[PDB]
Design a protein around this ligand. Structure first.
Ligand SMILES: [Mg+2]
Ligand SMILES: [Mg+2]
Ligand SMILES: [Mg+2]
Ligand SMILES: [Mg+2]
Ligand SMILES: [Mg+2]
Ligand SMILES: [Mg+2]
Ligand SMILES: [Mg+2]
Ligand SMILES: [Mg+2]
Ligand SMILES: [Mg+2]
Lengths: 153, 240, 115, 307, 48
RNA sequence: CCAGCCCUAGAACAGGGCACA
């Protein structure tokens, strides 16, 4: 019975899972886009969002400072977190990360793999799945319906 | 007959600047479950309607209270009990607090329900914070820290003392205790460990420390908007 | 919660409850259909090497709300006819015992403090 | 023809998704507002109450639990069941359903159109209502039948009554024999090897087989159970909430089928209750916000003291 | 009022070459803090 | 209708949700 559980078991225990997520968060802060297992990335996304919030909390905040000191293992990323990532996420509220499932690993384990990426990075944009255009048959029919509803008011 | 003059207040906001802070009782904070907020709204309306009749004051863990309960089998229909608040636990209409007092060498603990209609009057005789949010170690502490005068007079405090925190280290009975208060899961600062435990005992108790829980960032419960909405509802009910 | 082999503390002033002994007074048998006794339950004790009856006054296990919780498993010694052997009780007594006065009349008559 | 899988969002555009959402939302709002006055369009004939009559039930949502004190000092625990969207969907005649009593079908809270099948969507389109999540059948008498498509409210039950509550209990998955049947285990450490939770012997040597009624590990919980004789203490008419006594089977935020108590001690209690159902437009006078029982300590109380 | 950033030194218990160099600096600082010349020579030649 | 995503549903398969917000 695992009713109402939000964290999945990873690594060799709770502390090992924390350390794995910490390494993944350090790599994500450093490279602005990484790829790992789907479950590990899905677990790391929330920590990345909370880290961006703690970075937006400010530089002089001792709580945020010690949180960044714990999580970011490479100590050259804390100034980066506080002066690049947090300032560029100002008008946004919670849309800091983007996670997309990429094809399974070409290795023999065939692991379900995802890629996580901080929005607004200096990297080639991933092939995001774009919706259909309004010129499609069904979309044009729905546009006609919308125009009829607008004219009826 | 002559009556003496009252003593009015000489607050001067000019030289000292002092603002005012809000206090929300812990029973209004909803738990972390996925319950529908409509249940919390209903319970909050009920407990506000109850507080409209019964004045539930502000008191923290460590304060000394006196509760008057309706007892049918006593001489008088009321029964008073004075004791220190050991812990406050529960959410909504079922919030409870534990009062502890040593009466004739026998320590007695009573778990009172805040919103029980059998409670006539709750009186905080000493509004007082302590070094721990739950001082359940008073069972294993010396009795002098649990004896309180049942006929003690209420101590009136002014607003500008901001609930003085009592930094009182407590002596302890010999081992074993009701719980292992030396473990890091309790995080107790109100026990004088340096006189009852030893260095190797502290080192062995430090084996159960989990330093990652303070930096997990995912086990925290942010209730800023919830508390704001609760305060808005409280002000609306008070104005209604 | 007082069950078999539980060492209790005699509260009333009695020879058996005051005279020291090399073995504490343990509980022999609880007179409920369940093996656990609560406040106001007749019980059997082996005090000073002899069997005696007692009434559970207070225990350390938490019960219902607004009920007292004591720091010791307190018992008052009783006779076979239901009358207490002690003269008076100094320690406090739960006020809920006065609900059933038909069976605890002479026991409550010697109680001084009620909590 | 290797047709591929499709959903409602695959071929939609970035601009048509919100339009489709708002269109379905306004259609559902209009459909739910159209059925708000069932007693003036074409209501079925209301029959008088008879001693052998049975009433229809509701499908509510289990919100949570709350303490509730009675005027004698006792403290009970009540469960809050919120009747979100209860509508009578269809009616099957007595001879066509059971030959003894007719069957009224009742639907629960509203769900999305985009995740139901074609038959269910056709049925709900013909009825004129948005789809419901849980659909139950209630055995009613021929004189307590209601027209399909009528709404039902929590004021159907009155403060002070006994009800039956049916729901799927909290499923604990494939559980062992000790948690499923309450079997005792072997001692913990007195020599036992790899047996501390096994069922032990399962049958006898001469039978050379095990009996079908053998208690063995398996599924535990995800099954329908009924709690009988739960007392109703409070009815919140503003939010359509029922306060049933005790515990209700099933987790919170689940659909619960409530009906009148079929126990022999409460067989003729439906005399004073609204027989067909509670019609809020028939009285033309709004009920109080909260209907309490004659023993409940209401939140506004003089803080009762004994005399 | 002022930002207090932790130093940008490498890790101490890691497998990286920077961590190895930091441990080397640590034992060399132990040699520096050593008081007697006998202790200095012992710490300098205790590895064989 | 069941691609995917959640689940107080579950070993796998099954089962309930994904428009209000
Ligand atoms: Mg213990
Ligand atoms: Mg003998
Ligand atoms: Mg389950
Ligand atoms: Mg066992
Ligand atoms: Mg062996
Ligand atoms: Mg073993
Ligand atoms: Mg062996
Ligand atoms: Mg055979
Ligand atoms: Mg489904």
């Amino acid at each position: 019975i695992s009713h109402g559980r939000v964290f999945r078991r990873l690594g060799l225990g709770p502390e090992s899972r924390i350390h794995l997520l910490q390494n993944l968060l350090t790599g994500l802060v450093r490279h602005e886009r990484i790829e790992a297992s789907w479950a590990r990335v899905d677990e790391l996304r929330g920590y990345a969002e909370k880290l961006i919030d703690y970075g937006k909390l400010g530089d002089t905040n001792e709580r945020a400072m010690r949180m960044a000191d714990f999580w970011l293992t490479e100590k050259d990323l804390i100034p980066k977190l506080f002066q690049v990532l947090a300032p560029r996420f100002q008008g946004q509220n919670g849309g800091y990360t983007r996670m997309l499932q990429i094809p399974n690993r070409n290795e023999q384990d065939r692991a379900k793999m995802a890629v996580i990426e901080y929005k607004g990075n200096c990297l080639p944009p991933l092939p995001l799945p774009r919706r259909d255009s309004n010129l499609t048959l069904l979309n044009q029919l729905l546009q006609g319906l919308r125009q009829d509803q607008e004219a009826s008011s | 007959a002559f009556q003496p003059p009252p003593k009015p207040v000489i607050v001067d906001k000019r030289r000292p600047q002092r603002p005012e802070t809000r206090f929300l009782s812990p029973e209004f904070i909803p738990p972390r479950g996925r319950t529908n907020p409509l249940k919390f709204q209903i319970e909050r309306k009920d407990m506000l309607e109850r507080r409209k009749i019964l004045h539930i004051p502000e008191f923290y863990v460590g304060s000394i209270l006196r509760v008057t309960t309706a007892d049918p089998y006593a001489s008088a229909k009321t029964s008073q009990f004075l004791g220190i608040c050991i812990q406050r636990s529960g959410s909504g209409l079922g919030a409870t607090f534990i009062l502890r007092n040593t009466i004739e060498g026998q320590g007695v603990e009573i778990c009172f329900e805040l919103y029980n209609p059998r409670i006539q009057e709750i009186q905080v005789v000493k509004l007082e914070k302590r070094l721990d949010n739950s001082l359940l170690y008073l069972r294993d502490a010396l009795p002098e820290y649990s004896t309180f005068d049942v006929n003690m007079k209420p101590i009136t405090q002014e607003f500008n003392q901001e609930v003085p925190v009592n930094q009182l280290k407590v002596k302890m009975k010999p081992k074993p205790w009701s719980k292992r208060w030396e473990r890091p899961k309790f995080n107790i600062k109100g026990i004088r460990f340096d006189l009852c435990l030893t260095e190797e005992q502290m080192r062995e108790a430090q084996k159960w420390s989990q330093p990652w829980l303070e930096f997990d960032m995912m086990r925290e419960y942010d209730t800023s908007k919830i508390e704001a909405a609760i305060w808005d509802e409280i002000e609306a009910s008070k104005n209604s | 919660a007082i069950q078999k082999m539980t060492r209790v503390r005699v509260v009333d002033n009695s020879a058996l409850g005051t005279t020291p002994y090399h073995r504490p007074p343990r509980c022999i048998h609880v007179y409920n259909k369940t093996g656990v006794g609560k406040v106001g339950d007749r019980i059997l004790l082996a005090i000073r090497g002899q069997k005696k009856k007692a009434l559970i006054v207070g225990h350390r296990m938490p019960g219902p709300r607004m009920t007292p919780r004591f720091d010791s498993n307190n018992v008052v010694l009783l006779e076979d006819n239901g009358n207490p052997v002690g003269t008076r009780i100094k320690t406090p007594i739960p006020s809920s015992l006065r609900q059933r006065e038909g069976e605890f009349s002479k026991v409550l008559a010697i109680a001084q403090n009620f909590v | 023809h290797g047709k591929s899988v499709t959903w409602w969002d695959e071929h939609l555009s970035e601009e048509n998704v919100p339009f489709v959402k708002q269109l379905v939302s306004d259609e559902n709002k209009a459909q739910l507002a159209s059925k708000l006055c069932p007693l003036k369009d074409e209501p079925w004939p209301i029959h008088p109450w008879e001693p052998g009559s049975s009433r229809v039930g509701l499908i509510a949502l289990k919100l949570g639990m709350m303490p509730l004190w009675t005027k004698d000092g006792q403290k009970h625990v009540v469960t809050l069941l919120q009747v979100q969207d209860c509508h009578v969907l269809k009616y099957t005649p007595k001879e066509n359903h059971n030959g003894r009593m007719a069957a009224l079908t009742v639907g629960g809270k509203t769900v999305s159109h985009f995740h139901k099948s074609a038959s269910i969507l056709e049925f709900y389109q013909e009825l004129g209502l948005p789809p419901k999540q849980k659909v139950k059948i209630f055995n009613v008498t021929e004189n307590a039948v209601i027209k399909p498509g009528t709404p039902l409210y929590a004021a159907h039950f009155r403060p002070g009554q006994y009800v039956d509550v049916t729901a799927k209990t909290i499923g604990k998955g494939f559980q062992g024999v000790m948690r499923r049947w309450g079997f005792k285990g072997q001692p913990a450490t007195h020599g036992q090897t790899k047996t501390h939770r096994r069922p032990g012997a399962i049958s006898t040597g001469d039978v050379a087989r095990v009996w079908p009624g053998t208690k063995m590990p398996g599924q535990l919980g995800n099954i329908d159970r009924t709690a009988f004789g739960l007392k109703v203490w409070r009815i919140n008419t503003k939010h359509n909430i029922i306060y049933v006594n005790g515990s209700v089977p099933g987790h919170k935020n689940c659909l619960v089928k409530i009906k009148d108590s079929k126990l022999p001690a409460y067989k003729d209690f439906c005399k004073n209750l609204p027989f067909p159902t509670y019609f809020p437009d028939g009285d033309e006078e709004a009920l109080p916000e909260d209907l309490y029982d004659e023993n409940v300590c209401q939140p506004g109380a003089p803080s009762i003291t004994f005399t | 009022p002022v930002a207090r950033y932790p130093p940008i030194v490498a890790s101490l218990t890691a497998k990286s070459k920077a961590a190895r160099q930091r441990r080397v600096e640590q034992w060399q600082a132990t040699v520096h803090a050593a008081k007697s010349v006998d202790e200095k020579l012992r710490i300098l030649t205790k590895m064989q």
